[PDB]
Design a protein around this ligand. Structure first.
Ligand SMILES: *[C@@H]1O[C@H](CO)[C@@H](O[C@@H]2O[C@H](CO)[C@@H](O[C@@H]3O[C@H](CO[C@H]4O[C@H](CO)[C@@H](O)[C@H](O)[C@@H]4O)[C@@H](O)[C@H](O[C@H]4O[C@H](CO)[C@@H](O)[C@H](O)[C@@H]4O)[C@@H]3O)[C@H](O)[C@H]2NC(C)=O)[C@H](O)[C@H]1NC(C)=O
Ligand SMILES: *[C@@H]1O[C@H](CO)[C@@H](O[C@@H]2O[C@H](CO)[C@@H](O[C@@H]3O[C@H](CO[C@H]4O[C@H](CO)[C@@H](O)[C@H](O)[C@@H]4O)[C@@H](O)[C@H](O[C@H]4O[C@H](CO)[C@@H](O)[C@H](O)[C@@H]4O)[C@@H]3O)[C@H](O)[C@H]2NC(C)=O)[C@H](O)[C@H]1NC(C)=O
Ligand SMILES: *[C@@H]1O[C@H](CO)[C@@H](O[C@@H]2O[C@H](CO)[C@@H](O[C@@H]3O[C@H](CO)[C@@H](O)[C@H](O)[C@@H]3O)[C@H](O)[C@H]2NC(C)=O)[C@H](O)[C@H]1NC(C)=O
Ligand SMILES: *[C@@H]1O[C@H](CO)[C@@H](O[C@@H]2O[C@H](CO)[C@@H](O[C@@H]3O[C@H](CO)[C@@H](O)[C@H](O)[C@@H]3O)[C@H](O)[C@H]2NC(C)=O)[C@H](O)[C@H]1NC(C)=O
Ligand SMILES: *[C@@H]1O[C@H](CO)[C@@H](O[C@@H]2O[C@H](CO)[C@@H](O)[C@H](O)[C@H]2NC(C)=O)[C@H](O)[C@H]1NC(C)=O
Ligand SMILES: *[C@@H]1O[C@H](CO)[C@@H](O[C@@H]2O[C@H](CO)[C@@H](O)[C@H](O)[C@H]2NC(C)=O)[C@H](O)[C@H]1NC(C)=O
Ligand SMILES: *[C@@H]1O[C@H](CO)[C@@H](O[C@@H]2O[C@H](CO)[C@@H](O)[C@H](O)[C@H]2NC(C)=O)[C@H](O)[C@H]1NC(C)=O
Ligand SMILES: *[C@@H]1O[C@H](CO)[C@@H](O[C@@H]2O[C@H](CO)[C@@H](O)[C@H](O)[C@H]2NC(C)=O)[C@H](O)[C@H]1NC(C)=O
Ligand SMILES: *[C@@H]1O[C@H](CO)[C@@H](O[C@@H]2O[C@H](CO)[C@@H](O)[C@H](O)[C@H]2NC(C)=O)[C@H](O)[C@H]1NC(C)=O
Ligand SMILES: *[C@@H]1O[C@H](CO)[C@@H](O[C@@H]2O[C@H](CO)[C@@H](O)[C@H](O)[C@H]2NC(C)=O)[C@H](O)[C@H]1NC(C)=O
Ligand SMILES: *[C@@H]1O[C@H](CO)[C@@H](O[C@@H]2O[C@H](CO)[C@@H](O)[C@H](O)[C@H]2NC(C)=O)[C@H](O)[C@H]1NC(C)=O
Ligand SMILES: *[C@@H]1O[C@H](CO)[C@@H](O[C@@H]2O[C@H](CO)[C@@H](O)[C@H](O)[C@H]2NC(C)=O)[C@H](O)[C@H]1NC(C)=O
Ligand SMILES: *[C@@H]1O[C@H](CO)[C@@H](O[C@@H]2O[C@H](CO)[C@@H](O)[C@H](O)[C@H]2NC(C)=O)[C@H](O)[C@H]1NC(C)=O
Ligand SMILES: *[C@@H]1O[C@H](CO)[C@@H](O[C@@H]2O[C@H](CO)[C@@H](O)[C@H](O)[C@H]2NC(C)=O)[C@H](O)[C@H]1NC(C)=O
Ligand SMILES: *[C@@H]1O[C@H](CO)[C@@H](O[C@@H]2O[C@H](CO)[C@@H](O)[C@H](O)[C@H]2NC(C)=O)[C@H](O)[C@H]1NC(C)=O
Ligand SMILES: *[C@@H]1O[C@H](CO)[C@@H](O)[C@H](O)[C@H]1NC(C)=O
Ligand SMILES: *[C@@H]1O[C@H](CO)[C@@H](O)[C@H](O)[C@H]1NC(C)=O
Ligand SMILES: *[C@@H]1O[C@H](CO)[C@@H](O)[C@H](O)[C@H]1NC(C)=O
Ligand SMILES: *[C@@H]1O[C@H](CO)[C@@H](O)[C@H](O)[C@H]1NC(C)=O
Ligand SMILES: *[C@@H]1O[C@H](CO)[C@@H](O)[C@H](O)[C@H]1NC(C)=O
Ligand SMILES: *[C@@H]1O[C@H](CO)[C@@H](O)[C@H](O)[C@H]1NC(C)=O
Ligand SMILES: *[C@@H]1O[C@H](CO)[C@@H](O)[C@H](O)[C@H]1NC(C)=O
Ligand SMILES: *[C@@H]1O[C@H](CO)[C@@H](O)[C@H](O)[C@H]1NC(C)=O
Ligand SMILES: *[C@@H]1O[C@H](CO)[C@@H](O)[C@H](O)[C@H]1NC(C)=O
Lengths: 127, 445, 127, 127, 445
């Protein structure tokens, strides 16, 4: 089995297997001297914590916290990508796919948030 | 139909700027670089080679080199902060000749003792380079070279300037990509990429016009430059054979300590045991000009059938015209006019000791950053010191000619050591992993 | 649609729609100088992280992490509020409702935690 | 009822009741002077945040985030412990049980992560 | 079958090293210890006693004492940082006898005034201990004791040296275990363990050979040592009865302020109102030797039927040979020969004021950490200062005899101030809670 970030060149249909090694590595002398290396260490730790929480709050508000893969109610739009259903899962990697949808990440996030909030509003709060 | 899905921990990355934390074999004298203060190194760095991955690299537009330069200068200022400064040593010194052999000067000057009401008279040896007279007519009265610019700081003897290798690890969520391509020139797409959380052993040794204790090449001599045709750009070369060099300090100085104030001491050379001996370095002429022939034939592929000619330094500042390095706490300055004095033709072939004697200079008052101040006074190391280094690369600077001639001259290039760090960080690039992936599928079944 | 904190004056029945804009804004020169603004910036970031984690650990231990609205097993007590079932959801905003139950937040939190822990203990751990 | 860390000497079958008091206590002058106590305070807060996130990311990737007790698909191995099904839940405390499985924590974590990732891969991503 | 399960918030812990934060009573004069900077203390510390729990403790291998020592020295350096230093006071002082009564010396020395082109002549009183002559033959010319080592720093009068209690709280996810066993010796398994988030009132008072204002014993005299038979190990004892002591400073000094520079002042004693009176301390001889008898009979259980004899410490450093403490800003050094001078047999019985007069010495230039520099100049407190303390424990040092004799001599132990904090942190240990528990069960039903 490959190690950390070892399945980047593989296709999207096969690179979604070792996702746990990338998910686990997102966060990994007791007295601190607060010197040149100490300040940089503290800044790196705080930045890592902020990065993990920033990318985790999205999954928390999308109703998929603690889940590596989930499906929502937002349907796919052909304007973002005109490719077929499985031509990307069998021939394209994740490196050549992130740049094609990079201009629509914010729009997808807003639609995802409003759809999830609407679903929770209609499901919960009976009266 | 299709529904959008979110993938967590997806394997994608983008080029970004981020901070980096140290890593070294912490265990004992401390080291100016404070390697014991940072995180201890891992027993074995987990390095994984990514298959089917081709990534673009740019050693000249990288951010790790600039961040490394800022971290090294910050650690330098940090190490010089608790040490004693040279503020009362700006008194008018009285130096004469010592008892070529006129490089050293036997100085004599007044100095305030631990008693605030009394003073003390001491004597010490100082080099001519770190000595500047008040005027060019009086004679026998001199000052320090850095007195009207700033007050130098004496380095603490409890720490050493040994180039301890430091591992530049990436924070959580970030990674460092490594290019394992054979003979990669440092610019373009890499056909053999690998990833690792921390870089290899990076020795922050300071060198000019030559690369000491650097990383050897893989199979052939590699020339690195963003624009080889541009004459204003520096040229970095790498060698496959480690050219050895033996640099010694034959002068046997006696370390003495004088108290310039309450709770502070100043170190200087007392006398010399034996006689005056000029410091020099040795290098095998056969291997050196053989590697020069290989560099010339490698440069022949970029400049056509023209002949490569090497010349000495152009002239000016001693820091950029001579090869300098820190050898066990002593800063050296060797003249490289015997190493870049040859010509090579298309049909030329290089075809016993025969060592080359390179004269060297020693300076105690150094700046090492070309700054207008904040100098450092290197303390004298007792006894005779010897240094052996592995020459793995050099810096080149082409003369601004018309380029239509059959020959072009090359000079030993210099810099602010940023290109020196670039010569070691060319194989590494900093990326930011985005675990938030977007991809649709036929869900809801 | 309103922006961040734009539905505060609306009633509780209608202010529970744009909750995603307040949930998303709970966490949002690389070299730090650690000066007057640097220290305050680091303290503000650490305080924001602590605030988000402090208010998120409650939802984590209540069995509702990653959910904007959920229902528990703890029944409402008339001592906290004698109002009817829908007089607050149709005429009172969230500003005039937080002060009426402010003296019973700790009691509700303790009852919620013990009820959720008891439910998890009875459901899981079959033998 | 016992307070924080008050049921350590009890058996494992009864010490799993007051887990909410230990789960709640995992995170609990405005201007900071950044002195000797200020630096140590900031370091302690950052270390506490890192500890909570480090022990929470495991539950997040194991499919049990926000749940005090959950069951997975990984079966128990007799090599780790040859004891019976209920001799530890009725006579042994948690202090005498953590040392017996201390040498197999990493192996169990890796098997748990791969099994959970495989389950999510087989359940989700229909085509 | 069986399936593995994960328990969150499980009650387990392991010994680990971690940082700690202060907790003082929020209330004004700041205290050298900067207790107003840490988190305010809780109205009531939540302390829970764990039932059926037996935990192993080790006071000598604890990390809290080392961390506490580093924090106290760091706060000391922090408090002395914004204050004025004594760098221009290293002038050759001229002292004579004052107008035994020869302990104080009336000094006269030159000093630079606020004007950079002018100076001032002042006079002040200094003790003989903090006075060192240039040579042993001239006479009437002296210097400070710490002038050729480092420059002392005058303590800021805006802060006080009151031993205000501080609570050493543990960070989130960590806890401090407390041993409520009656007469626990500090090493081994505790049969009555309790847990708490923050420790009790820890007064960081610095004392040598005697424990002042410490925690009293529960039921009997307890002797603490990792190896009682080892002669190289220190011995810490605890008492059940608080032995009172009255230490006064009969000298009535007049605080005067002189400006040694622009924006800085120096404080010293001007004169003495009345006459010369030697500082001393009082203690009830009946209670003191009664407690000595109890300590002797307690030590009899470890050394057999041998008789216990107490003798004074061996000559050397004044900080170790004498008992030191502070009365709101004034350091003392009392002779302990008047207390550790007796012998106790197996059949011996101790069987009215009768106070014991203990001569004491006062020093202004103190190091308080046995460091080669970074001294502190204690400012003189105006008026008569008297502090009363509760003697709760002492430090012992056994002589390296052959052990075959019927008697062994005990000396007043001392040395590093680590034992001072160890005598208060013996009941506490630092642990790390691991909320990730692994246990199987018959699930999936
Ligand atoms: C490229 O890399 C090479 C190989 O590492 C470097 O060569 C080394 O240079 C350092 C100095 O920079 C040399 O270290 C010095 O050696 C002397 C004594 O060392 C002997 O004993 C030790 C015992 O541990 C052996 O490891 C060593 O091989 C020798 O046998 C002394 O001059 C120095 O001692 C210093 O520390 C002590 C302790 O405080 C002090 O008392 C001394 O005064 C002094 O400060 C120092 O240890 C080292 O020997 C060289 N190695 C080799 C193999 O030759 C090059 O310097 C480096 N190039 C550049 C440009 O940096
Ligand atoms: C063990 O613990 C005991 C008990 O706490 C300590 O004894 C105390 O020692 C301190 C000094 O270390 C004493 O405090 C000093 O008292 C003097 C005036 O106090 C009067 O006023 C207060 C008002 O509340 C009364 O409580 C008190 O009884 C007296 O009537 C002065 O010398 C000091 O004042 C200082 O501060 C002010 C403000 O800046 C200045 O103006 C003064 O000049 C001076 O600097 C100070 O307040 C205290 O009284 C003692 N308590 C008792 C009960 O006797 C021991 O010191 C301690 N042992 C050790 C070794 O630390
Ligand atoms: C730089 O000049 C100074 C000052 O002249 C020299 O220092 C002094 O050198 C002399 C000659 O070696 C030493 O004298 C010898 O000392 C002792 C005691 O007197 C004894 O061995 C001999 O009788 C002789 O006099 C002397 O010790 C030394 N230092 C002092 C403080 O007087 C120094 O040598 C000169 N340096 C160089 C490199 O020329
Ligand atoms: C240490 O020596 C100094 C210097 O001699 C002493 O200070 C001086 O003390 C005398 C008294 O002993 C003062 O004299 C008196 O002063 C005033 C004004 O003249 C007045 O009360 C009397 O007429 C008498 O002259 C003198 O002024 C004073 N000097 C200064 C500059 O203040 C000091 O007392 C000695 N200390 C000890 C402890 O003996
Ligand atoms: C990428 O380059 C590395 C070397 O930089 C290659 O690793 C070598 O592989 C061969 C064949 O297995 C081994 O014998 C060598 O020992 C390896 N060298 C090192 C330094 O590890 C690697 O094979 C290259 N990858 C590709 C895909 O060509
Ligand atoms: C380093 O190698 C790269 C290719 O790997 C060179 O980049 C090419 O340079 C030529 C110069 O004529 C251009 O025409 C190409 O378009 C460049 N290719 C790419 C992909 O950018 C680069 O010049 C080399 N540098 C040196 C100093 O040899
Ligand atoms: C690299 O440098 C070369 C010359 O060394 C540049 O090519 C020409 O440079 C001259 C000046 O020396 C300009 O007047 C021309 O306009 C340049 N030509 C072109 C086509 O740019 C060249 O531009 C530099 N850069 C690259 C990316 O090759
Ligand atoms: C630099 O190279 C020149 C030749 O280009 C050398 O000059 C010759 O030196 C030899 C002795 O080494 C003399 O016999 C010749 O007469 C010199 N030739 C000329 C044309 O002057 C010179 O020695 C070289 N310098 C170094 C340091 O190697
Ligand atoms: C540099 O000079 C010192 C001082 O003379 C030399 O140290 C002495 O070396 C001799 C060698 O026989 C020893 O016997 C002495 O004990 C050494 N110390 C003294 C104080 O005399 C040192 O060896 C010299 N270094 C070199 C490389 O010659
Ligand atoms: C552990 O020791 C503590 C004292 O350190 C005991 O607490 C005492 O209990 C008695 C009997 O209930 C009370 O009268 C005392 O007031 C308590 N003392 C304190 C200081 O609180 C406790 O009982 C002991 N536990 C066990 C199991 O023996
Ligand atoms: C403190 O008490 C413990 C026991 O509670 C003592 O530990 C014993 O030390 C002796 C030393 O010879 C060993 O032989 C025993 O095996 C130890 N017993 C246990 C249970 O570990 C310790 O010596 C005591 N210390 C003092 C100063 O009395
Ligand atoms: C505690 O100290 C005693 C002596 O005070 C140690 O016992 C012996 O010590 C002598 C030297 O005094 C050694 O030669 C013996 O080998 C020691 N015997 C043993 C059995 O160790 C003793 O070792 C120390 N430590 C403990 C844990 O009791
Ligand atoms: C220490 O000396 C000072 C200065 O003489 C005394 O302070 C005076 O005390 C008397 C007592 O009757 C008061 O009337 C005065 O007002 C005080 N001040 C001055 C400026 O004279 C102080 O009392 C002395 N302390 C002791 C304990 O005797
Ligand atoms: C220390 O103890 C000794 C006895 O061991 C005391 O010496 C005696 O002192 C009394 C007066 O207190 C004299 O009458 C005796 O003649 C002394 N005896 C001897 C044998 O010299 C001594 O006083 C004690 N010191 C203190 C400070 O208590
Ligand atoms: C020494 O300890 C005793 C108790 O062991 C203290 O005496 C108590 O003092 C307080 C002060 O508020 C009184 O309220 C108590 O009534 C006293 N208790 C007893 C039993 O007398 C004494 O104050 C301590 N001494 C010092 C200097 O702190
Ligand atoms: C798809 O995207 C386009 C371009 O942004 C937009 O006009 C269109 O409404 C979108 N369609 C759906 C169904 O969301
Ligand atoms: C990617 O590399 C792997 C490993 O050798 C190989 O099996 C696979 O065929 C490659 N894929 C492509 C598209 O080249
Ligand atoms: C150096 O180059 C010269 C000139 O090409 C050649 O004759 C010689 O063999 C080479 N080596 C040495 C050691 O001189
Ligand atoms: C370097 O060496 C050459 C050898 O010819 C000499 O001419 C030149 O002056 C030297 N340069 C310096 C700066 O000493
Ligand atoms: C409601 O609250 C009151 C006041 O605290 C309390 O006495 C009562 O028991 C509570 N009722 C229920 C059903 O929890
Ligand atoms: C149980 O553990 C042992 C020892 O590590 C291992 O050999 C064996 O394969 C494991 N069995 C199962 C069913 O996982
Ligand atoms: C002290 O001990 C002596 C000698 O044992 C005894 O006579 C005396 O009563 C004790 N007390 C006093 C106050 O001297
Ligand atoms: C302490 O007291 C003893 C009593 O014998 C005496 O000899 C000694 O000189 C005194 N002083 C010191 C500083 O030890
Ligand atoms: C105890 O008895 C012994 C043996 O007779 C004697 O030497 C010693 O003085 C006695 N101790 C007293 C009376 O304190």
């Amino acid at each position: 089995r490959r190690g950390f970030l070892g399945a980047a060149g593989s296709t999207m249909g096969a690179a979604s297997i070792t996702l746990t090694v990338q998910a686990r590595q997102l966060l990994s002398q007791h007295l601190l001297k607060l010197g040149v290396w100490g300040i940089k260490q503290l800044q790196a730790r705080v930045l890592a914590v902020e990065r993990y929480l920033r990318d985790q709050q999205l999954l928390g508000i999308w109703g998929c916290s603690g889940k590596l893969i989930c499906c929502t109610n937002v349907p796919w739009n052909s304007s973002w990508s005109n490719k077929s259903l499985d031509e990307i899962w069998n021939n394209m990697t994740w490196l050549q796919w992130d740049k094609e949808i990079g201009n629509y990440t914010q729009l997808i996030y807003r639609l995802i948030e409003e759809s999830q909030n609407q679903q929770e509003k209609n499901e919960k709060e009976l009266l | 139909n299709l529904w959008v899905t979110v993938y967590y921990g997806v394997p994608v990355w983008r080029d970004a700027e981020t901070t980096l934390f140290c890593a070294s074999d912490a265990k004992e004298k401390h080291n100016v670089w404070a390697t014991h203060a940072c995180v201890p190194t891992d027993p074995n760095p987990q390095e994984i080679h990514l298959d089917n991955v081709t990534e673009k690299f740019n050693m000249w537009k990288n951010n790790m080199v600039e961040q490394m330069h800022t971290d090294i200068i910050s650690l330098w200022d940090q190490s010089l902060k608790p040490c004693v400064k040279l503020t009362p040593l700006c008194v008018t010194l009285h130096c004469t000749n010592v008892t070529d052999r006129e490089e050293l000067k036997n100085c004599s000057f007044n100095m305030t003792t631990e008693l605030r009401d009394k003073r003390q008279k001491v004597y010490s040896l100082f080099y001519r380079l770190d000595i500047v007279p008040i005027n060019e007519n009086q004679g026998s009265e001199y000052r320090l070279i850095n007195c009207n610019t700033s007050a130098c700081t004496q380095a603490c003897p409890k720490v050493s300037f040994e180039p301890i290798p430091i591992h530049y690890c990436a924070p959580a969520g970030f990674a460092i990509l490594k290019c394992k391509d054979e003979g990669f020139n440092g610019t373009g797409l890499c056909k053999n990429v690998s990833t690792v959380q921390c870089t290899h052993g990076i020795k922050p040794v300071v060198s000019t016009q030559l690369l000491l204790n650097g990383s050897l090449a893989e199979k052939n001599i590699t020339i690195r430059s963003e624009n080889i045709t541009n004459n204003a750009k520096i040229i970095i070369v790498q060698l496959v054979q480690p050219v050895t060099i033996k640099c010694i300090r034959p002068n046997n100085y006696t370390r003495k300590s004088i108290r310039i104030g309450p709770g502070q001491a100043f170190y200087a050379m007392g006398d010399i045991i034996g006689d005056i001996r000029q410091a020099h370095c040795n290098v095998s002429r056969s291997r050196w000009n053989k590697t020069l022939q290989e560099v010339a034939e490698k440069l022949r592929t970029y400049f056509g059938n023209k002949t490569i000619i090497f010349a000495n330094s152009s002239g000016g500042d001693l820091e950029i015209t001579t090869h300098s390095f820190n050898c066990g706490g002593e800063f050296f300055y060797c003249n490289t006019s015997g190493l870049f004095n040859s010509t090579w033709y298309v049909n030329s072939t290089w075809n016993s000791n025969d060592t080359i004697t390179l004269p060297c200079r020693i300076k105690q008052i150094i700046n090492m950053w070309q700054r207008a101040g904040q100098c450092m006074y290197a303390p004298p190391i007792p006894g005779v010191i010897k240094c052996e280094s592995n020459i793995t690369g050099l810096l080149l600077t082409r003369d601004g000619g018309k380029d239509n001639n059959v020959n072009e001259t090359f000079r030993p290039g210099g810099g602010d050591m940023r290109d020196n760090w670039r010569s070691e960080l060319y194989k590494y690039k900093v990326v930011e992993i985005e675990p938030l992936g977007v991809a649709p599928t036929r869900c809801k079944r």
